[PDB]
Amino acid sequence: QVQLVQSGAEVKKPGASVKVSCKASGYTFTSHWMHWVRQAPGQGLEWIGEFNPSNGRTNYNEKFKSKATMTVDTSTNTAYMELSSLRSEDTAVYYCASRDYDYDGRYFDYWGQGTLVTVSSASTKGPSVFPLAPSSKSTSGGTAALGCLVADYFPEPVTVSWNSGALTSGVHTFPAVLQSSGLYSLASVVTVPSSSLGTQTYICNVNHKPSNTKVDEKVEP
């Protein structure tokens, strides 16, 4: 299976540089062009450029010519994009994507998961995680709600899974809210049967890559 796995979210002070990576697998790396696409949080999609790993050819959006440098390392099947002289408006999700025509005429099109780069002078901060326990005050007709509050982190993003991704039905992980302080908080919740609170275990798995924070919190009745 074709996979493109990008490096984790980062925060960077203005004037700095960052190099985002995109590791390809499941196909012959040199056989397809690698693209880079920007989407700032909440300017849509913009094409940065493309790099041909078979011959080193590049084509850039003129807008990004001074900003971005695309390279590859064919020995590790990895594409890179380096952004220099970072300013606040460089805050965006950056995607890598392998896209072009096969010789037969079918279009090959696969995308990485994206990498959020935040440009800020503010300090990175790891979250506090608080279970929201199922109780008689969070039941509704045989169902119990439970969750985790992920408080006071910077910058975005936080990701949350339940039971290492084995619990996805009925999960709602909410968009983050901006606190007065400039930090963020988010909540994730799930509804489950109230009947089996005694026999099932529910763990929220919280990741905040900028502070390399990985926390697993058991949420118990």
């Binding site: 849509g44 094409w47 279009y107 969070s138 509704s140 983050a176």
Partner: protein
């Protein structure tokens, strides 16, 4: 350089409706593509070369072109089709994207299921009480939460967030958090969230007494 205008910016439609999105280009484009993007996810190719379906894409999706005007059509809108759709053209070694069209779903009225979460011991040890009210799986999106503490309406000390529309049931959920210091929390007894929504004929209150 090619300028494009994508319309409309957003639309709302019922399950089974025909949805049509247009991309108008300043000059003739060499290649037209259509992408679908769901929130938090990467774009997914649906259509390449104006009208060719990407592999495994359902037959309800189609594209066409007439000069500098390009259209994308979903013949029968399904709940899983909510997304923002983008045209992307290529000419003369440059790709450019349209502005996007957010496609929403209409469905029947569904009242929220309401749940409340008293602050844990872990929270209170941290010095701050965050009381959480969850409104689950409702439609339409518009809802109102009011917090009452010993029946006194609160202002200035809550935050709320709403999900994207659900790809299975076309509902929304909302979370509201009342934040007080531990000291302020311990000065009061009854904590209540009051919910108003089109599916409810009168406000629904969910409440608890501190310490039980």
């Amino acid at each position: 350089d090619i300028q494009m205008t994508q319309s409309p910016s957003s639309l709302s439609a019922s399950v089974g409706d025909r949805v049509t999105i247009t991309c108008s280009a300043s000059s003739s484009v060499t290649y037209m593509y259509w992408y679908q993007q769901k929130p938090g996810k990467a774009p997914k190719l649906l259509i390449y070369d104006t009208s060719n379906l990407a592999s495994g894409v359902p037959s309800r999706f189609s594209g066409s072109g007439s000069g500098t005007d390009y259209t994308f059509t979903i013949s029968s809108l399904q709940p899983e089709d909510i997304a923002t759709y983008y045209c992307q053209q290529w000419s003369s070694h440059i790709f450019t994207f349209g502005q996007g069209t957010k496609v929403e779903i209409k469905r029947t009225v569904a009242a929220p299921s309401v749940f409340i979460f008293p602050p844990s011991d872990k929270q209170l040890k941290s010095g701050t009480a965050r009381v959480v009210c969850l409104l689950n799986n409702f439609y339409p999106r518009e809802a109102k939460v009011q917090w009452k503490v010993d029946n006194a309406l609160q202002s200035g000390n809550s935050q709320e967030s709403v999900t994207e529309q659900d790809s299975k049931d076309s509902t929304y959920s909302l979370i509201s958090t009342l934040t007080l210091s531990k000291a302020d929390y311990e000065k009061h007894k009854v904590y209540a969230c009051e919910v108003t929504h089109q599916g409810l004929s009168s406000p629904v209150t969910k409440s608890f007494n501190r310490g039980e």
